[PDB]
From Swiss-Prot, chain A:
Residues 1-19 are annotated as: Disordered. The lineage of its organism: Bacteria, Bacillati, Bacillota, Bacilli, Lactobacillales. The keyword rRNA processing does not apply. It comes from Enterococcus faecalis (strain ATCC 700802 / V583). Belongs to the bacterial ribosomal protein bL27 family. This is Large ribosomal subunit protein bL27. The N-terminus is cleaved by ribosomal processing cysteine protease Prp.
Curated annotation (Swiss-Prot), chain B:
Keywords: Ribonucleoprotein, Ribosomal protein. Residues 20-48 are annotated as: Disordered. Residues 25-48 have a biased composition (Basic and acidic residues). This is Large ribosomal subunit protein bL33C. Pfam families: Ribosomal_L33. The keyword Ribonucleoprotein applies. SUPFAM superfamilies: Zn-binding ribosomal proteins.
From Swiss-Prot, chain C:
GO terms for molecular function: structural constituent of ribosome. This is Large ribosomal subunit protein uL30. The keyword NAD does not apply. CDD domains: Ribosomal_L30 (cd01658). One of its GO terms (biological process) is translation. It comes from Enterococcus faecalis (strain ATCC 700802 / V583).
Swiss-Prot record, chain D:
It comes from Enterococcus faecalis (strain ATCC 700802 / V583). Keywords: Ribonucleoprotein, Ribosomal protein, RNA-binding, rRNA-binding, tRNA-binding. This is Large ribosomal subunit protein uL16. Part of the 50S ribosomal subunit. Belongs to the universal ribosomal protein uL16 family.
RNA sequence: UGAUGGAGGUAGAGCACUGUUUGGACUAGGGGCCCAUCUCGGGUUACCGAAUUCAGAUAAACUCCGAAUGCCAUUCAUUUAUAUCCGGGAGUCAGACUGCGAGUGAUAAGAUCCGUAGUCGAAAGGGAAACAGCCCAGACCACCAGCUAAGGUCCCAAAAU
RNA sequence: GGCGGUCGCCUCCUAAAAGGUAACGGAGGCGCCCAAAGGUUCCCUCAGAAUGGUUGGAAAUCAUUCGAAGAGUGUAAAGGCAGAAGGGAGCUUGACUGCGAGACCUACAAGUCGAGCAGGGACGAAAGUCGGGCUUAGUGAUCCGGUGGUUCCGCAUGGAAGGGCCAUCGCUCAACGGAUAAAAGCUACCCUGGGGAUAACAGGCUUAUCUCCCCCAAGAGUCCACAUCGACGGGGAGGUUUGGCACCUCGAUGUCGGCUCGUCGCAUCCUGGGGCUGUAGUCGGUCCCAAGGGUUGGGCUGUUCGCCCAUUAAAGCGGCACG
RNA sequence: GUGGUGGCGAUAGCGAGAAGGAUACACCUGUUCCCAUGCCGAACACAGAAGUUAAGCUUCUUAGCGCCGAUUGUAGUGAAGGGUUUCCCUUUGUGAGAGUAGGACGUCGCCACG
């Protein structure tokens, strides 16, 4: 019989492009590297992308078919 | 039979670590070099 | 230059963004009028509720 | 007609909006029977139409069935209340949208083709029109 | 609301993957018959045909693609006037229908279950003969004054026989 | 309501391109595993196919070529990874201690990520990486107990007893936010509080089923689709059936059959009129019109129904809270 | 020109063909040396300069494949309505995928030897 489902995990983008964030702010929750960590951005043990410094978030292209998040301080 | 174990410090006898082992694959007591917070140094730790 | 906007249709039964647009423009009762600059922001608002308003230059 | 195997035993009924995605032109035969309304076509209906056509053609020429009943549908028996999970699969349907050519024929003179496709159309739950290949 | 920048794979579409599938060509291989039988090599039903290829379909749990919208954001712009936070006091945890998008159901139900907007609830007035939920519209009051909305204008019954 | 199913956690679809989102909706997994299948350093690239080749066979090992991933990634699925997260090897134990700016998630309790700082390390020449594993399941509050540690307390005082603090163990408390350390049934002998929030009767909505009526016409009918019948399929009407729903009624809407009294519909049983006939006649068949009237008494059974007996011009079918 | 080393979505690729080595880059010659092969100096490592451009590699030609891809039209769809309302239609904005005209056999740097 059916009738089961796991709790939803609230994945996806947590900070906006062009938004100023403090260091440590989570930018993107994901399974796998759907988006890659760019400049001043790290990737956690469960693929969460977080800011390493204070700066403005930019979602960028990584080559042809990949994306990327970076944080640029002012 | 995978079981939970404690790794005691062979120097000061502090039960410093919680870990687990498969007894079938590791019959003898697991021995590891682990940092002892009491002695503040890496010491031989053995399952007790 | 200027836009004279008059509320000609009721806001009852309309979505929230349209009621809030009417309020953002400063319109109240039906047939209430208001004069606004012909900015791109104001013209955008008129477009959102054009079915509810009449506008004059 | 029935698929030999299916990935999922049960499927949504779905929706039939718009004209058919593909198969709107006669592709293999000389004459086609075009659906002008959207409707589920059962495998029983496809078979009745097919036999009605071939027999009138007197085993002459070729017949192409351009639709397949990919989709299953379930039912609940009389006396069964609502709830307690989706019913067991009952039959197979092809969802057919207006403009889909359901059948094509070739190898027979036009007079026979027009009467062949007329007899088939009366077996289907959809209104139809004859279409000549271009 | 506008501008700008982003995330996201739905509608549609497509087949490049995975399932489902039609015809054609050709085919390893697969069925019986004879000659030859040590069952060893052939020749055939326009016998069944993998895979390949050509053409054509199909998909909630397929995707080479992919919107509209919605969403997040900006020391941004215009209009607008709310937002949070701290504390006192609650009530609410049976909802309904209508439109739209889905599931369940027989793409039955004034059915059921979500999403979304509205009205009812807790809203009188006008229209829909009557008719909570539809359409128009929100009653602080007075008037034997005027203009309109939906809907109307031969009589009941106001207004174009 | 019962029976069955379900109860916590993970992945997907549903879910409407942020997030979230229900149903006894559609599919699967979990209650672990690993001493490397962890860390690091260095190195490596797959599955298949074609061709050749002893045992050797479709397929075990070998060689070349082709091959962008069609493999693998312990374990479900999704997302990801071949600048590897896949594969091999050396050394290792960071599957470190104290923590932790800032975020995500969130009613709470919890859950998730985390740069960076210090202590002491592993690998590496160094850069640097390392606080387990491609990612997301593999779990359980408190109370009460066990064990280890402890510069804490010690009821006059020293001790002790007994506590505290830190670490860790004992949950299919799985009805998985766990009522108790400890618990199954019968009630037609029943009772109270409530509910049309919720069933049984009747109404209502629906019409799958049912009854009736049609479309197409392969066929049957010696020939001949359509006198009559009519496969495979298709479309309706009705609201008498079997059902679905739960909208009025549970501060009660009395339930089958019969009796009495009927009344209405017409999809007409008889009688009246008519067309076609595979209508000689007599009997009939079938369709059309027609609701004026008529439409039996018994045997059995509570029965309705039905079988039977004997009649009849006939002995119609339904509705009216199954009047 | 060649050899290093980078940025830019393959418009940078792939296949086919042609030319070149002065240097350079490679094949290449060896296992004494550090080091190496779950066997093999093939590789890795080291030492070397007889030969060769044959291959790689550079440059050049080709769009056959892959990649990029305007416009128009259409699907869908926001908003506002409508009907004969499981569907369909009008108005207004937006606008694909497909299929195509075409583009493209790269471009922008820095260093070294010429
Ligand atoms: K038809
Ligand atoms: K495909
Ligand atoms: K899809
Ligand atoms: K609704
Ligand atoms: K209101
Ligand atoms: K290792
Ligand atoms: K419980
Ligand atoms: K009793
Ligand atoms: K009906
Ligand atoms: K009828
Ligand atoms: K006849
Ligand atoms: K009652
Ligand atoms: K009666
Ligand atoms: K007659
Ligand atoms: K009568
Ligand atoms: K009797
Ligand atoms: K009796
Ligand atoms: K009753
Ligand atoms: K060498
Ligand atoms: K060469
Ligand atoms: K090219
Ligand atoms: Mg999920
Ligand atoms: Mg982890
Ligand atoms: Mg679609
Ligand atoms: Mg309802
Ligand atoms: Mg109320
Ligand atoms: Mg009212
Ligand atoms: Mg009332
Ligand atoms: Mg008048
Ligand atoms: Mg007139
Ligand atoms: Mg959405
Ligand atoms: Mg979402
Ligand atoms: Mg691994
Ligand atoms: Mg004392
Ligand atoms: Mg004492
Ligand atoms: Mg619970
Ligand atoms: Mg008794
Ligand atoms: Mg009582
Ligand atoms: Mg009551
Ligand atoms: Mg009720
Ligand atoms: Mg009643
Ligand atoms: Mg209800
Ligand atoms: Mg009463
Ligand atoms: Mg009649
Ligand atoms: Mg395009
Ligand atoms: Zn120690």
């Amino acid at each position: 019989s059916n009738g089961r489902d796991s709790e939803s995990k609230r994945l996806g983008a947590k900070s906006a492009d062009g938004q100023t964030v403090t260091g440590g702010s989570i930018l993107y929750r994901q399974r796998g590297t759907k988006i890659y960590p760019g400049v001043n951005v790290g990737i956690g043990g469960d693929d969460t992308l977080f800011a390493k410094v204070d700066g403005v978030v930019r979602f960028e292209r990584k080559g042809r078919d990949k994306k990327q998040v970076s944080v640029y301080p002012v | 039979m995978r079981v939970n174990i404690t790794l005691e410090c062979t120097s000061c006898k502090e039960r410093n670590y919680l870990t687990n082992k498969n007894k079938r694959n590791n019959p003898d007591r697991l021995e590891k070099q682990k940092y002892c917070p009491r002695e503040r140094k890496v010491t031989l730790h053995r399952e007790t | 230059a200027e836009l004279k906007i008059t509320l000609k249709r009721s806001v009852i039964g309309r979505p929230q963004n349209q009621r809030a647009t009417v309020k953002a423009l400063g319109l109240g009762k039906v047939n209430s009028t208001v004069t606004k600059p012909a900015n791109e922001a104001i013209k955008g608002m008129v477009n959102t509720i054009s079915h509810l308003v009449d506008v004059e230059e | 007609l029935v698929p030999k195997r299916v990935k999922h035993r049960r499927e949504f009924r779905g929706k039939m909006r718009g004209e058919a995605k593909g198969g709107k032109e006669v592709a293999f035969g000389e004459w086609g029977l075009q659906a002008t309304e959207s409707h589920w076509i059962t495998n029983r209906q496809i078979e009745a139409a097919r036999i009605a056509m071939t027999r009138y053609m007197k085993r002459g020429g070729k017949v192409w069935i351009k639709i397949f009943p990919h989709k299953s549908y379930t039912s609940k028996a009389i006396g069964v209340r609502m709830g307690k999970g989706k019913g067991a699969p009952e039959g197979w349907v092809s969802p057919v949208k207006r403009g889909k050519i359901m059948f094509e024929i070739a190898g027979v003179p036009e007079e026979v083709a027009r009467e062949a496709l007329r007899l088939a159309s009366h077996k289907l739950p959809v209104k139809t029109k004859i279409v000549k290949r271009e």
